[PDB]
């Protein structure tokens, strides 16, 4: 009956064919076959839902590429003369900078008393007003020569920027072997801090970013020292990661304004809600997201606030759990840098002249920078969701047609059967 | 009839069970199907023209493996006494030279209205005789130390090469923590250049490369300071891609005599065609691609051809529309660079005394580089044809035969069903 | 008969119609397909018995993850005035070292013949015991300052280990922008060795390695000079690769006292196993692998058998053929370093005055290294078996379904029909 009518092989021959050993062997077969389709198709589904996934990486010279955006810093962070007589202001801005440096303060200690008293007493203090017009400034004296794919570039191109060594210039803010070339004039005689918080070095500190994010210092910016040229050789790395299932990503999340997600903007952003909830104000160093915190809210409010923020970890990073989950994009500068002594002994004697400074100077002052695109200047990897549904359903249709011919159609006529028979 | 005899499921419930709930809900199911073997068919053919790919890394040691080829060329191009009386020289090699590095050269300017009347005069003048002897040089008294592998090497095994940089030799021309080891005289005393046109750093620039590929310095080369040891560890990372279809490549191009394709070679070989004919000679700095241009044609011809061919873009590279599409194999030697001082203070005065020169010099001539290959010293990356015709061949089969067990021959019976009822 | 009964297509319709022009085009069908369906089955095969394989890549930000291992060696192997008299220790070190460091050594040299004559005679000689005692060391005068995520650590916290370089010394033995900070103080004028034998550069080599790993300095060790500050920011790339038809790895290859397998464990322990053969003792350079061989014992017995090793190729690595195959898990910390200026102006003066010591001192023989934690500090590459047994079920199901819409069933009956003509 449904043996002769059913499209599952095997069964036709057990009623077809009476004799004893086929009509029994034929079934054993049956039954033999049908659950070894049971434990693959198991293995197959068993296996789809781990999300598995296949990356691609791509290669490639890009002739016309957009250059990134690049970002300067004085190891040096206060001018000499206007700190000579105000050193308390290095304890000061190290509470204030708490904010992007998250290093530990130890109370009791001689720089945090004397400065709590003077916060104390000196709440008209404007922290901001200070440190934007007594540190680090790009000028005709500081930067000496620079030059953008061969055009002239003057400091009007250099957006100006607040981070924990001070005032930071940013370059091409919002082709092989070519790129960004600029000479510093450090100053060490005109710029100037404290070297018992660990600022001993001196020259130019720079990171190289997207310019839709904001720069990270912290302890990852590149540096460059002063007698030297370095040539910085980039190249664009991207890379795009799945959903949470398959990967950490998780694009539901987006930022203030709806502004492009990025890790560093999230943890940035849930660091200032945080410390609007327990103080009324935000700190400058996180700029757009309230008022300016007064100086002494910084000594009370603000800094056990930052501590207990990382005691209790509520601004983890990662993981889809966490709450600054992966970016879906990621776009990436690896660089290489190479030096050479800067000043000749052609060109120190003429620098010396145009520069009317001593050799000694020169040789201790200057910080020449160079920052090119590679030749094989991009590169993108991918991760690819494996398989799909479509994917899935055509594994499962070769099992189950290898060992049993069926189909759904077949299924269905197994249903049917045994609904008669119930 | 055809119900009984199509292996397509489903019809012969339609025919061989008349219940009207049966006889119209099978077919119901055939339809269902039948679209969904459309749908899922064309998603399957639909993905398979797009030339997806996939990529295999691996990475390995090789105990005997081929050291590169390493160029070298001295941040100071000519010798000192060869130019002082000579000063337009600077501005000839930098007409001259305009080939290599694209740099634009500014009319009007007093040091090319010397040059453009200097070469008015001076026809004869043969810039390759000049540069080839007063120009820098591989001697005992410049290189004064070199090991490879462990084995003495000389001056006479280093092959000359000219470069925008002047002189210029490659080594080893066509094991872990081993490499080339060399001591350099860059000997600033003997060899100068202009300042005033941006050649400011002393040092040695040196660039690592195929034996069978010419050295592209451009703002590509890695440099290295006097007076500190460089030690430079590289690996060899090799990547293949697809043809056009699948990836950039393009094996049927193939450069002037058949040689190996190169993109570098490419760009080349294009601009040195397109220059001979709008001039009828070649720049010596393209070698093989016809006769050498006299003086002035530099200023007249071969110059105002560069910046029409930059102008209207006619050297594009990457994509396969390029002039140069990408090559069908890359190899790239990325670098790692980490510096000592160089001489020690017991090394100082030893050097001092076998040298016989001043303490003074030492620290501003002598350079000392190391290249060396690191344990993991290769790496290939492959793309891969992530399926060809057998592979879609299997996904249509299981699709196809899942949702209703069809197969070609069933499509032929339906064919064949038709043409009869037609 | 059975074309009525059995599922292959096509014969069906051979006995059926019986019509001339049908019952010999639908044979023709059949067969032609099914030489196809052999082609595309034994293209499946072939391919998969290639044991093809394909890699996934993952990056992340972990927020606490665990620090390498760091070890530091100072460039200047001896103290001064432990070696003035004693002149014939560098010899009798360089053929000692010998067994990390396989360089040559030339017989009939000077060195070498004051060296061997003193082994003869000073026979009680124990170099293990005065390189431990009048080498490197760690010490408050030696390192001036040291933190570890902001808190201070002690020289306690290095330990002590051997190399060709000497006493060295490993930190952390068994988050972004934070890391390990040190400052050494190489102390020129208390540590010196023979220029004469190619040692003139002066600073710190380090390596960073896993805590499980004994360092494999070579010509492998990251360095950095004196007078400036190194900024050094890794990354942990960790690869798995499968087994030895898939990869090269060989997980049933285990270590003496069944320890973690590493390839460079492996050939020391190759090594240290041939040494004890030829001869009856184990250099102490080889820790755990027996006694140490008396002075005597260098020049007569392991000199000989180490220049035997290389030369029969008995230590050959790499391949799973090799003696020592590539490990199943591999586990790279990539470095990029930048460097500044250490001692400023302003800090030069300050130094001066804390350490009691001239400038000249300071800018000579401070060294200040900087180890920190990219923030995409992780990434893993993984080699996967693109098909397993699994797999390729389902594409020999879908091939054989397509053409032929046949099934393993459909064999059978196949074979029994054949059975019962023969
Ligand atoms: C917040 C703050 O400092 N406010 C002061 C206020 O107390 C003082 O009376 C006034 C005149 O000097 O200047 C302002
Ligand atoms: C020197 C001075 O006061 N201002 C200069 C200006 O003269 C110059 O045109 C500009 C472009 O470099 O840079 C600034
Ligand atoms: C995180 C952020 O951008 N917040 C801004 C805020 O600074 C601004 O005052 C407001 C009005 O434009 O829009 C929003
Ligand atoms: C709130 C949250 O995400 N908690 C996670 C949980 O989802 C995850 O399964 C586990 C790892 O096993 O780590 C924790
Ligand atoms: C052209 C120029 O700037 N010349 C200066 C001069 O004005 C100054 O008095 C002297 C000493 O400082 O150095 C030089
Ligand atoms: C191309 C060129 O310069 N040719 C000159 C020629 O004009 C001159 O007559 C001859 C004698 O000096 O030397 C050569
Ligand atoms: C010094 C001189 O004039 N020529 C030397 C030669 O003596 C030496 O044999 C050779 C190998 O280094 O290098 C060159
Ligand atoms: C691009 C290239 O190599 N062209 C060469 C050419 O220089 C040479 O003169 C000719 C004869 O051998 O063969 C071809
Ligand atoms: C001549 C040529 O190759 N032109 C290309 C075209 O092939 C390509 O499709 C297009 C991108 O959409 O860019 C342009
Ligand atoms: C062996 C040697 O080269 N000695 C030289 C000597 O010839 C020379 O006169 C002196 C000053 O130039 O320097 C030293
Ligand atoms: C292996 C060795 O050197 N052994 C010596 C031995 O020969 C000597 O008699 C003894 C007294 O000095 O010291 C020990
Ligand atoms: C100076 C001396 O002899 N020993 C010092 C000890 O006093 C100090 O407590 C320890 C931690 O830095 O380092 C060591
Ligand atoms: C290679 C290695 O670790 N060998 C050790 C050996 O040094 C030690 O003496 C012995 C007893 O613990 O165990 C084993
Ligand atoms: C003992 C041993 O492994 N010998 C190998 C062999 O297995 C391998 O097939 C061949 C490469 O073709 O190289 C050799
Ligand atoms: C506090 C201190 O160490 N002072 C030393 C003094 O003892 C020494 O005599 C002098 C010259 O060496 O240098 C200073």
């Given at each position: 009956d449904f043996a002769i009518s059913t499209?599952?092989?095997?069964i036709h021959n057990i009623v077809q064919n009476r004799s004893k050993i086929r009509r029994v062997l034929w079934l054993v077969v049956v039954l033999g076959s049908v659950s070894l389709v049971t434990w693959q198709i198991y293995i197959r589904l068993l296996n789809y839902f781990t999300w598995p996934t296949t990356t691609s990486i791509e290669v490639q010279y890009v002739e016309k590429m957009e250059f990134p955006a690049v970002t300067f810093c004085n190891?040096?962070?206060?001018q000499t003369d206007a700190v000579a007589k105000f050193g308390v202001i290095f304890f000061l801005w190290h509470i204030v900078s708490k904010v992007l440096h998250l290093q530990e303060i130890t109370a009791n200690s001689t720089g945090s008393r004397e400065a709590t008293d003077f916060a104390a007493s000196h709440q008209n203090f404007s922290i901001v007003e200070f440190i934007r017009n007594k540190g680090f400034y790009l000028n005709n004296s500081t930067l000496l020569d620079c030059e953008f794919f061969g055009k002239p570039c003057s400091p009007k191109d250099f957006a100006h920027v607040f981070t924990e060594y001070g005032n930071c210039f940013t370059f091409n803010h919002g082709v092989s072997g070519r790129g960004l070339s600029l000479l510093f004039n450090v100053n060490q005689e005109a710029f100037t801090d404290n070297?018992?918080?660990?600022?001993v070095d001196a020259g130019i500190i720079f990171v190289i970013h997207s310019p839709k994010k904001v720069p990270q210092f912290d302890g990852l910016g590149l540096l460059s020292p002063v007698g030297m040229h370095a040539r910085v050789t980039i190249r664009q790395v991207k890379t795009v990661h799945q959903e949470?299932?398959?990967?950490?990503?998780?694009?539901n999340i987006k930022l203030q304004n709806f502004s492009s997600y990025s890790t560093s903007g999230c943890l940035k952003e849930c660091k200032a809600q945080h410390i609007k909830k327990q103080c009324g104000c935000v700190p400058?160093?996180?700029?757009?997201?309230?008022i300016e915190c007064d100086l002494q809210k910084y000594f009370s409010c603000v800094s056990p606030v930052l501590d207990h923020i990382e005691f209790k970890d509520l601004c983890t990073v990662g993981?889809?759990?966490?709450?600054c989950p992966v970016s879906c994009e990621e776009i990436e500068y690896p660089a290489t840098i190479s030096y050479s002594s800067?000043?000749?002994?052609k060109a120190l004697k003429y620098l010396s002249k145009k520069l009317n400074q001593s050799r000694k100077y020169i040789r201790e002052n200057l910080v020449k920078i160079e920052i090119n695109y590679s030749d094989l200047n991009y590169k993108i990897t991918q991760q690819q969701k494996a398989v799909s549904v479509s994917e899935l359903l055509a594994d499962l249709g070769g099992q189950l047609g290898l060992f049993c011919g069926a189909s759904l159609i077949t299924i269905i006529e197994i249903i049917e059967y045994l609904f008669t028979n119930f």
């Amino acid at each position: 009956d449904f043996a002769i009518s059913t499209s599952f092989h095997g069964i036709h021959n057990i009623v077809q064919n009476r004799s004893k050993i086929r009509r029994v062997l034929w079934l054993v077969v049956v039954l033999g076959s049908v659950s070894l389709v049971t434990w693959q198709i198991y293995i197959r589904l068993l296996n789809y839902f781990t999300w598995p996934t296949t990356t691609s990486i791509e290669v490639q010279y890009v002739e016309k590429m957009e250059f990134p955006a690049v970002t300067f810093c004085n190891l040096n962070r206060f001018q000499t003369d206007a700190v000579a007589k105000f050193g308390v202001i290095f304890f000061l801005w190290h509470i204030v900078s708490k904010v992007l440096h998250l290093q530990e303060i130890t109370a009791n200690s001689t720089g945090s008393r004397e400065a709590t008293d003077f916060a104390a007493s000196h709440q008209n203090f404007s922290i901001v007003e200070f440190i934007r017009n007594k540190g680090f400034y790009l000028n005709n004296s500081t930067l000496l020569d620079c030059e953008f794919f061969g055009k002239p570039c003057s400091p009007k191109d250099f957006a100006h920027v607040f981070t924990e060594y001070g005032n930071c210039f940013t370059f091409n803010h919002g082709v092989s072997g070519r790129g960004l070339s600029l000479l510093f004039n450090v100053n060490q005689e005109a710029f100037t801090d404290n070297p018992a918080l660990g600022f001993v070095d001196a020259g130019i500190i720079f990171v190289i970013h997207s310019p839709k994010k904001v720069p990270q210092f912290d302890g990852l910016g590149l540096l460059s020292p002063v007698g030297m040229h370095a040539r910085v050789t980039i190249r664009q790395v991207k890379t795009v990661h799945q959903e949470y299932p398959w990967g950490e990503c998780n694009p539901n999340i987006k930022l203030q304004n709806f502004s492009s997600y990025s890790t560093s903007g999230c943890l940035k952003e849930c660091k200032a809600q945080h410390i609007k909830k327990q103080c009324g104000c935000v700190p400058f160093l996180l700029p757009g997201y309230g008022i300016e915190c007064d100086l002494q809210k910084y000594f009370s409010c603000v800094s056990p606030v930052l501590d207990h923020i990382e005691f209790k970890d509520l601004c983890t990073v990662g993981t889809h759990n966490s709450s600054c989950p992966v970016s879906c994009e990621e776009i990436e500068y690896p660089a290489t840098i190479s030096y050479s002594s800067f000043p000749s002994q052609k060109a120190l004697k003429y620098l010396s002249k145009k520069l009317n400074q001593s050799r000694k100077y020169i040789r201790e002052n200057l910080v020449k920078i160079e920052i090119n695109y590679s030749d094989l200047n991009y590169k993108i990897t991918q991760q690819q969701k494996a398989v799909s549904v479509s994917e899935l359903l055509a594994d499962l249709g070769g099992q189950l047609g290898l060992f049993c011919g069926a189909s759904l159609i077949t299924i269905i006529e197994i249903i049917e059967y045994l609904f008669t028979n119930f």
